[PDB]
């Protein structure tokens, strides 16, 4: 039996431009076991229309998943992803920084 | 193309 | 250049909540093309790339049969492993498999793979010579003996050198617009003050395909591997990939640093300076 913490990234598909349609991504990788929970947040609230990729894994057997939604960023709107996994003491919130 | 059967078990 | 086809399967038991879930995905290089999910309603191998949709009913019938067979075998393998290790039936366990082949720039067979991991650790793997097995522990040694007796190596070698290569070549032709492409990284650099004593220099690579890339920082032309934050290569969602590498720069020292980028789409490696 083993445990590996997810590496979490929240980011846009294209460089953010206010008023321009885009995609908001949360990529979780390097984790084990495979059960994981991801939400995308808009101003602290769960976004409803979020899809995810099919479960796959890397050469080291660690899993990766992409969660994504269409979004139109603005100046003031705040975005984040929230991730839970057995290796995390509590859900981890990572804020979207349009510069990473 | 997927690998053909049958799988020999562990 | 070279190309790969890979299938990745994951079986996860769920004690008290019915039978294990089985998920398999197929890839050509870094492009996914099929999936099967034992929990899904269709109970069919499903298309996940535009260029696989061309395949007729016989393909979907055959591939569905094969992946369903695998799902049942790994369900049995999970039970077998529990017994081998004398583990409690109360705990969830994971069985992963990877198989597939590589071809060279001419389309000739290059390498084959057929390997399992149990609870995230190597269990048994077909060696590069496609003639023998590597067994991780005593349990896997039992499996190795069974597979030797059953001539699994020869059967899988025949698949890997034959059908696997033929399929990969066919997909490469049918999806040539998507698969036989190189998107070079678009690169740039950003600067983020953290205090009046330090700032972050971040080097970006965006919109690249395939995913393989090397991004490094040097200071005065010297290695900075231990002092560089390097994020995992990530999908953009549009069939391209992204990555960045960052260093913490002391105030006024920006010009000592150079970012280096190597990718299949770059005829020469790039050197970037702030």
Author numbering:
A (entry chain B): 0 to 99
B (entry chain C): 1 to 10
C (entry chain A): 1 to 274
Task: Provide text from the study.
In contrast, in context of the Nef126-10 epitope, the mutant Y135F peptide (representing position 10, the C-terminal anchor of this epitope), dramatically improved its binding to HLA-A*24:02. In order to examine the impact of these mutations on epitope structure, we solved the crystal structures of HLA-A24/Nef126-10(8I10F) and HLA-A24/Nef126-10(8T10F) at 1.66 Å and 2.0 Å resolution, respectively. Superposition of the Nef126-10(8I10F) and Nef126-10(8T10F) peptide structures showed almost similar backbone atoms, with root mean square deviation of 0.307 Å, but conformational differences were found at P6 (131P) and P9 (134R) residues. In addition, the B-factors for the central portions (P5-P7) of each peptide (41.5 Å2 for the Nef126-10(8I10F) and 46.2 Å2 for Nef126-10(8T10F)) were higher than for overall peptides (24.1 Å2 for Nef126-10(8I10F) and 33.2 Å2 for Nef126-10(8T10F)). These results indicated a flexibility of the central portion and P9 residue in both peptides, accounting for the structural difference observed. The side chains of P8-Ile and P8-Thr protruded from, rather than being buried within, the antigen-binding cleft of HLA-A*24:02, suggesting the P8 residue could be involved in the contact with TCR. The shorter side chain of T compared to I might make the Nef126-10(8T10F) less accessible to TCR than the Nef126-10(8I10F) epitope. Interestingly, Nef126-10(8I10F)-specific but not Nef126-10(8T10F)-specific responses were inversely correlated with pVL, suggesting that responses to the former, but not the latter, contribute to in vivo immune control. Nef126-10(8I10F)-specific CTL responses showed significantly higher avidities compared to those against Nef126-10(8T10F).
Cytotoxic T lymphocytes (CTLs) are key players in the immune control of Human Immunodeficiency Virus 1 (HIV-1), as they recognize virally-derived peptide epitopes presented by HLA class I molecules on the infected cell surface. We reported previously that the substitution from tyrosine to phenylalanine (Y135F) at the 135th amino acid of the HIV-1 nef gene is frequently observed in patients with HLA-A*24:02, an HLA Class I allele expressed in ~70% of Japanese persons. Nef codon 135 is critical to both epitopes, as it represents the N-terminal anchor for the downstream epitope Nef134-10, and the C-terminal anchor for the upstream epitope Nef126-10. Our results indicate that Nef-Y135F, selected to escape recognition of a well-described HLA-A*24:02-restricted CTL epitope in this viral protein, results in the creation of another HLA-A*24:02 epitope immediately upstream.
